[PDB]
């Protein structure tokens, strides 16, 4: 409870990892034609946040 923060044609990509209790997020966005499955090509994700949370994650779930 010790933290709070506030800020098919579209493909969004993310990476989530937790290290030294910091939680790190990276992302990228692009329009696409090959909507079936991940388009073969290359584009690097870049950092968004580095949250100082100190939490013991082993599961996740998406929110629709």
């Amino acid at each position: 409870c010790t933290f709070e923060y506030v800020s098919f044609k579209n493909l969004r990509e993310f990476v989530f990892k937790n290290i030294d209790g910091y939680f790190k997020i990276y992302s990228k966005h692009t329009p696409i034609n090959l909507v079936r499955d991940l388009p073969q090509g290359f584009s690097a994700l870049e950092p968004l946040v580095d949250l100082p949370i100190g939490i013991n994650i082993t599961r996740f779930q998406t929110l629709l």
């Binding site: 010790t2 030294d20 209790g21 910091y22 100190g54 939490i55 013991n56």
Partner: protein
């Protein structure tokens, strides 16, 4: 009573009981079933 003790930068605030032996303690304190926190004798 306010001042107490039991990866890096962890913060395990859980009060859940020690199974200090093989007992299914179920929050019942007793021999081999102990509450994890203690207050300092200040």
């Amino acid at each position: 009573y306010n001042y107490r003790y039991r990866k890096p930068f962890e913060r395990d605030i859980s009060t859940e009981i020690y199974q200090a032996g093989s007992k299914p303690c179920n929050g019942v304190e007793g021999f081999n079933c102990y509450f994890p926190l203690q207050s300092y004798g200040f």
